[PDB]
Amino acid sequence: PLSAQQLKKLEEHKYSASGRSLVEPPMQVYWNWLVEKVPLWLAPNTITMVGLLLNVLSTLILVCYCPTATEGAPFWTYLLCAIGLFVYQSLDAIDGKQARRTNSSSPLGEMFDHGCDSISIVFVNLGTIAAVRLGTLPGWMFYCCFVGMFMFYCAQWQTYVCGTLKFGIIDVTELQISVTVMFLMTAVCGPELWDYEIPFTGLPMKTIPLLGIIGGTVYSCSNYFRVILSGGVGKNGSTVAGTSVLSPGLHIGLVLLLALMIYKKSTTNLFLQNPCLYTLAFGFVSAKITIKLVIAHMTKSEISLQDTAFIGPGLLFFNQYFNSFIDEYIVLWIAMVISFADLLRYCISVCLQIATHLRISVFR
Amino acid sequence: PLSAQQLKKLEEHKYSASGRSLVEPPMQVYWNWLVEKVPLWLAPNTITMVGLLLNVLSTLILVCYCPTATEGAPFWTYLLCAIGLFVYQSLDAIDGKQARRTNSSSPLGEMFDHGCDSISIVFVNLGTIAAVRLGTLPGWMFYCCFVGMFMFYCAQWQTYVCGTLKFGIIDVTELQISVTVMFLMTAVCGPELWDYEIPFTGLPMKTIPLLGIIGGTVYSCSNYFRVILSGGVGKNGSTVAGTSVLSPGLHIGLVLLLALMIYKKSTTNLFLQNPCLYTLAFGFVSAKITIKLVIAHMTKSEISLQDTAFIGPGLLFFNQYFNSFIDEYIVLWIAMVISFADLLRYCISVCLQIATHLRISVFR
Ligand SMILES: Nc1ccn([C@@H]2O[C@H](COP(=O)(O)OP(=O)(O)O)[C@@H](O)[C@H]2O)c(=O)n1
Ligand SMILES: Nc1ccn([C@@H]2O[C@H](COP(=O)(O)OP(=O)(O)O)[C@@H](O)[C@H]2O)c(=O)n1
Ligand SMILES: [Mg+2]
Ligand SMILES: [Mg+2]
Ligand SMILES: [Mg+2]
Ligand SMILES: [Mg+2]
DSSP states (O other), X not given: OOOHHHHHHHXXXXXXXXXXXXXXXXXXXXXXXXXXXXXXXXOHHHHHHHHHHHHHHHHHHHHHHSGGGOSOOOHHXXXXXXXXHHHHHHHHHHHHHHHHTTTOOOHHHHHHHXXXXXXXXXXXXXXXXXXXXXXXXXXXXXXXXXXXXXXXXXXXHXXXXXXXXXXXXXXXXXXXXXXXXXXXXXXXXXXXXXXXOOSSTTOOTTHHHHHHHHXXXXXXXXXXHHHHHTOOOSSSSSOTTSSOXXXXXXXXXXXXXXXXXXXXXXXXXXXXXXXXXXXXXXXXXHHHHHHHHHHHHHTTOOOOSOOTTOXXXXXXXXXXHSSOSSOTTHHHHHHHHXXXXXXXXXXXXXXXXXXXXXXXXXXX | OOOHHHHHHHSSOOOOEEEOOTTHHHHHHHHHHHHTTSOTTOOHHHHHHHHHHHHHHHHHHHHHHSGGGOSOOOHHHHHHHHHHHHHXXXXXXXXXXXXXXXXXXXXXXXXXXXXXHHHHHHHHHHHHHHHHTTTSOGGGSHHHHHHHHHHHHHHHHHHHHSSSEEEOSSOHHHHHHHHHHHHHHHHHHOGGGGGSOOSSTXXXXXXXXXXXXXXXXXXXXXXXXXXXXXXXXXXXXXXTTSSOTTSHHHHHHHHHHHHHHHHHTOSSOHHHHOHHHHHHHHHHHHHHHHHHHHHHHHTTOOOOSOOTTOHHHHHXXXXXXXXXXXXXXXXXXXXXXXXXXXXXXXXXXXXXXXXXXXXXXXXX
């Protein structure tokens, strides 16, 4: 999975990040106080795995009770989702702090952190789509999920063009806090709160989050794109690996364009009837693509545009080309299963290789 | 177009071929007698260019008077085709002999010979399809043209796996002689000769050539495939370049499979109504692919499966995917023009680079 030269360049890697947000000081104090009361013999990898597992299980439960994201759910699911998200954020901060001390830092930890972040953001966007019941506005339904995916990939990609993480003021902390408080408010008030049309403007309440999200969208994009153009660390304005500046753009554009092309020619309402399956399959594809870029920018190697991850999308596209010989409901399940198995195999193989080389005992 | 190392390996190349056919001695004596009466100041490249030009012009005239390969043509076209084919064979033998003497041999000459052979075999197969009026048997119409293309590519490919050309007993000489005599017989007797159903077996006369061709087909394939499997020249049974044995098979399979896939889902009789345009576009594609393999096996480099020659087939495939927004008659013309321009540009660039390096003055 990893070549000898690339693995050799993996060592002597120094993690670096600069930036601060508005709510950073108080939550920072809280996380510091909580990490003073953590057991000393616990490994950070177990912490991040536990956090990701809790978040995934809770979001999966919420999705299972709300297919198509247009029905209602009890307070049980919303409360569990809020608790899981809060615990995920807390464990992220705590295992970061505990890995920074007691000389347990390793390059595999950052890889685990980034992969967990990808999966968690996909599941969080699914949960916040299902909770608000955004099935009454079919126009704004592709955009939300796939713009969350696109923004995470763009953050990784602008990190590729530079050497240090740059943190803004509207970063993940505020997003997670807002989503948690929104889940709590929906649980306490009921799923019909977003059907409490505001006495003016003739628009429902669901426009209040969405518009803001769009605003944040633009803002985030702005920053990222600047680092794409003005930023340069190598011998020129090119990437740190010496390759072209806009290579990952082709990967993300291919994924999103292929998703849109399959969506627009379904002829049987493939997406508006099975949104969770569609989003999960393409989220696994995008998660593998993002992990590849994470590994690429940890080292100084180069990425290609030929992967054994377009199997599922390829099957969908070639089953759409021929008119119909397999109904477009089992093909989606096959694609999701293939993508999940491929991502799991890739992650397990890379983790095993790194553990064998550095004799880390990943879980210890 | 040619890398420095590959161009350096181009030099110190020795042409080698072994084999003999049944009719080789008499035609060999004739060609020797004719080359004793050739001017000494004429370059072989001009000879092969003249032969290819005559063959192409005559076949183009015959095709223009017989679109769809189901109408009749005057004796003028058939006589011109027979004369052009005979002159092409004669000039091939003569310029080969004249290049072998008077120290004018160069690696560019073999490249010209192979490219001319590719174009000539494509046009000869079109001419023999049009002359026999094989439009009354739509089942056996894809097979003929594309099996001619496939056989030439397979001959080149088995040459790739070894170092020397192997000549059988049913080689190009007998094919050309048979086609010439068939053109002469059709001209003297008329296009209706193939509508003179043989008093027995209840089959028309056009089965007499076709079956034989099929037989020859199998025979040729046999020999080639043996060299594909038993043959080995490098450190192992692999190719002389050290790469995989069955890499060009992917190229030829992609071309033929894509042609068949576009043919089988035309919905408007794209091939059975415009056979000459279809065959010419895919013949230009296959000619460029074959020239690439010729250059590869002249040197010891490696070929890829990513070319700027699938533009035309890509446009056809993606215009078929979307139902129809451009009628499937201008797209074919665009594809043919693009393929022809690409092949001409590639050939001109390679010829200019070789002439600049070796200061040959190609035409002199
Ligand atoms: N399981 C883990 C998680 C993080 N780490 C390391 O600990 C550092 C602290 O990360 P963090 O979570 O505080 O930082 P951010 O989450 O803000 O990116 C990471 O950059 C990794 O190098 C680790 O070694 N093992
Ligand atoms: N225009 C040409 C044609 C052939 N030649 C060379 O002359 C040799 C004789 O080829 P040939 O035509 O007698 O052989 P075949 O046609 O049987 O392959 C070729 O192998 C080339 O090396 C050349 O230098 N310039
Ligand atoms: Mg962390
Ligand atoms: Mg994290
Ligand atoms: Mg010759
Ligand atoms: Mg020749």
